[PDB]
Design a protein around this ligand. Structure first.
Ligand SMILES: *[C@@H]1O[C@H](CO)[C@@H](O)[C@H](O)[C@H]1NC(C)=O
Ligand SMILES: *[C@@H]1O[C@H](CO)[C@@H](O)[C@H](O)[C@H]1NC(C)=O
Lengths: 62, 379
């Protein structure tokens, strides 16, 4: 897994923009999610939010 | 009053050549023989964790943030008489190892008789990787005259950046310590915010719809520095990339077509657009970088790079740096001032098939980036 930490989380964005995801490294004090977008850019989001878990469960369904 | 970073697109003689080891040339000759693009900026230090620390990006402008590359740090070492600093006191680290002493080498060129005492180190990481220099005491910074960084992208293009000490472009790189907020578990974590400001008329389109523009391209590096936990001699420092995503929104893509328009065929897609980047170059070379990924979790990054001379022998014809570009084809039509991009794709359309392509053409003063979204699979 790519080594990176979330310094601040991002606002929700439409599902049609997220293409992948992966949890943050164990070096990060706070567990965060890093979404990969159809623009091939990384976006940090708080895993403790519902829309994040919905994007995650829906991402693994595909 | 241009005190920002600047870049030149060089017309290297041997585009097949690369950084040869061991180091055998002076910094200047290395640039002249292996750099297709150079970025000039300042070399600044910051007293942290008991030593002056300088943070430099392996790639100033992130063409493909996730692409892997091979970087080389070559700095010039010379302490003034009144500075009793040993070569053994300089430490560096990057995306691969902990803080350590680099290897030094003396290079001589009887051509002009020049001689330099260099220190070097080799790295392999993404375009978002970093190189950190650390020198002791309050006077150590004076020993490092300048720091070159060569980065051979996936496309095979040489992207260099020279950071001289006391460079006139003092505002091209500003670094200021910030609070870490305990984001990382590193012991004694110290966060740094390095701001990179370049004077470049940059425009970013999605197909032919403008997304962003400006007279200066800024990039902010939020980096955490510290040490891994340990259990009961050496002080091996490392860094961790910090992603501050609260600042931006996805509004620019809110209006981009879900599938970027283009001419679809059996085995390729063709995109046409109008560009004045070759006319404003004013006889200067143009560095065209195209790369695409048809994958999500992961897929082969197809990258290519060309240098287009804008006048002289063989005028306005792409010259290849890589062996050859199979996935992508690029041609410029001066009469219409239009560019045509061709992408090899799989002849079968299907659902869930989403591809992404990015073409960045840039001169010394202008820069155009164009994002293409495909409903087919890239070769
Ligand atoms: C530098 O190296 C010499 C031996 O090469 C050593 O004797 C001296 O103490 C060192 N000076 C400093 C400031 O580390
Ligand atoms: C962190 O800061 C202070 C400096 O005295 C102390 O806790 C410790 O020495 C530092 N960490 C390490 C690994 O030395």
């Amino acid at each position: 897994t790519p080594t990176a930490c979330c310094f601040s989380y991002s606002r929700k964005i439409p599902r049609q923009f997220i293409v992948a995801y992966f949890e943050t490294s164990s070096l990060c004090s706070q567990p965060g999610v890093i979404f990969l977008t159809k623009r091939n850019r990384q976006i940090c989001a708080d895993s403790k939010e519902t829309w994040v878990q919905e994007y995650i469960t829906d991402l693994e369904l595909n | 009053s241009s005190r920002l970073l600047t870049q030149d697109i060089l017309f290297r003689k041997d585009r097949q050549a690369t950084i040869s080891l061991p180091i055998k040339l002076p910094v200047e000759d290395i640039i002249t023989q292996t750099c297709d693009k150079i970025t000039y900026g300042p070399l600044k230090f910051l007293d942290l964790l008991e030593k002056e620390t300088a943070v430099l990006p392996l790639s100033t402008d992130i063409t493909c943030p996730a692409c892997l590359g091979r970087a080389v740090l070559v700095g010039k070492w010379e302490c003034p008489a009144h500075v009793a600093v040993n070569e053994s006191d300089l430490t560096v680290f990057g995306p691969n190892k902990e803080e350590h002493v680099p290897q030094f080498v003396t290079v001589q060129q009887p051509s002009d008789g020049k001689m330099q005492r260099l220190f070097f180190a080799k790295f392999l990481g993404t375009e978002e990787s970093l190189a950190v220099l650390r020198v002791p005491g309050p006077d150590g910074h004076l020993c490092i005259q300048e720091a070159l960084i060569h980065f051979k992208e996936l496309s095979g293009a040489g992207v260099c950046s020279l950071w001289k000490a006391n460079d006139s472009r003092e505002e091209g790189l500003e670094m200021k310590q910030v609070d870490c907020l305990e984001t990382t578990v590193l012991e004694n974590q110290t966060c740094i915010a390095t701001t990179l400001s370049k004077k470049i008329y940059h425009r970013l389109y999605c197909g032919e719809r403008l997304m962003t523009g400006g007279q200066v391209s800024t990039r902010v590096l939020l980096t955490a520095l510290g040490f891994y936990k340990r259990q009961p001699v050496p002080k091996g420092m490392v860094y961790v990339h910090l992603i501050d995503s609260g600042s931006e929104d996805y509004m620019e893509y809110s209006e981009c077509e879900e599938v970027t328009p283009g001419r679809y065929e059996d085995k390729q897609i063709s995109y046409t657009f109008y560009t004045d980047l070759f006319q404003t170059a004013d006889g200067e070379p143009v560095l065209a970088s195209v790369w695409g990924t048809s994958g999500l979790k992961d897929s082969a990054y197809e990258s290519c790079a060309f240098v287009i001379p804008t006048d002289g022998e063989e005028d306005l014809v792409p010259r290849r740096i890589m062996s050859k570009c199979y996935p992508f084809r690029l041609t410029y039509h001066p009469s219409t001032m239009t560019v045509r991009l061709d992408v090899r794709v799989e002849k079968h359309h299907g659902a869930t098939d989403q591809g992404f392509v990015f073409l960045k053409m840039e001169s010394g003063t202008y820069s155009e980036g164009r994002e293409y979204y495909l409903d087919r699979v890239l070769w």
